[model samples]
Target: QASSRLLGVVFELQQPFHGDLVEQIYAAATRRGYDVMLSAVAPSRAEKVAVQALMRERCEAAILLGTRFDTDELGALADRVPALVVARASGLPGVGAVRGDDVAGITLAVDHLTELGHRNIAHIDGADAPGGADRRAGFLAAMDRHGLSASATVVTGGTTETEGAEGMHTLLEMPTPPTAVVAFNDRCATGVLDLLVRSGRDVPADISVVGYDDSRLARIPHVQMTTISQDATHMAEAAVDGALAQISGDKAVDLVLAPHLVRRATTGPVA
Candidate 1:
């Protein structure tokens, strides 16, 4: 017998774009009179262990944030409980998923840069990241829409500052460098900013930079990064709704929340 008022939560500790996903979920659940059993999971293999532990706790439902568990593992877990995934979709039956609209977010960035007279643009790609494929697709589509696809270039910049620096380094070495850059996420964009600043390149003066995910990094005074916002609060509420539906024996479907641009100091007219 499961407690009618209990929900389990597992959060992934990584370079989080939405660090508040689990917090939002917990807050929503508590407001509904539900008690929560929470645990933190890493990108380690031990994530499987934590998932199994939550299942054994007899929680009526479980929510995962950026779980590293593979398809087969998640599929197995879905068999036992109403599972809700935040920020990443797990393609399995009995699972509910919620994430932001990567295309809309990237489109906003592209539109802003293009309108500011930027034609030579570049993107620091997020290879194999949770929403990497979608963001990449969005960037391509948005670039094409602005007719800058021919001049735009992409470099392998993972979800790390080092990768961002390396990607910018590579891009700067090009015979003709870009006038604007859009990174995969805030972390990578910060890296680009750091590198550019150290190299005596003034941001938005010599080049404009844009990032994704309006995380804490983007809010800092030094890194008031122009980026996109993923509505974590809305996504969390939807996840709870979907999870509760599944727990009540109703089928749950996936969700994609729209993302919007948050303009700040990093972007301006191309120089």
Candidate 2:
């Protein structure tokens, strides 16, 4: 029999087609005989109110997806329920986290670019998000390690494809434009690639591109973006398992998954 207790999942975005990660989390919870309630909200001021509504409905625990909330807001929500944050980090007490290895993923991208003879590699950073800082730091560290720190340029990218395209434009305006570019995620990479093509730049011939999150975007025949893959299925399962474990009075634990690189047509020897 399923437990009377329900687990609530609050996602920061409402794109159903792109909600595969949260869907996997719910599937894992249902397999464990628990009721799962899901909700999605825009990255607006109403996030706290939505989360509080879940707590008021007697959800035993909650998982927050996306990096929309600040740390202080997360701490406030943690006080209302045993909370687990996905794709973001909150150092608040009583909160657990499950996130991809952003730093390691960036390192993989940089190493791949360096090996392919890309010395003027630039980065499209994810702007002020929690994981973004770590990824930016990782890119810098990798550049320093390869003795190409002076040649690296970073452009600010918000959480949208349009912003990514704009960032690429900003990068192109630099005195010495990069021959290889690494974007924060697959969507961002696609935006940059679109701009590159519109400018008549040949992919992997005039420039190479890399992206994070080997999402469906990477698998598209025309895109075929070289990217970093985090085991989303395993990560989702672990998040659900951790919530259940806590509900069963188990000690809290933090899980960090390693990231790997996937090569495709988008990245090649720097032109």
Write candidate 1's Cα lDDT for 77-109 as tens digits.
888888988777778767888878888888898
TM-score of each: 0.93, 0.93
Q: Which candidate wins on lDDT?
A: 1
- Regions of model 1 farther than 4 Å from truth: 1-4, 43-45
**How many clashes would you count in candidate 1?**
0
Candidate 2 residue lDDT tens string, 173-214: 888999999998888888899999999999989999998878
The lDDT for every candidate, in the order shown, is 0.84, 0.82
In the predicted model 1, the residue pairs found to clash are none
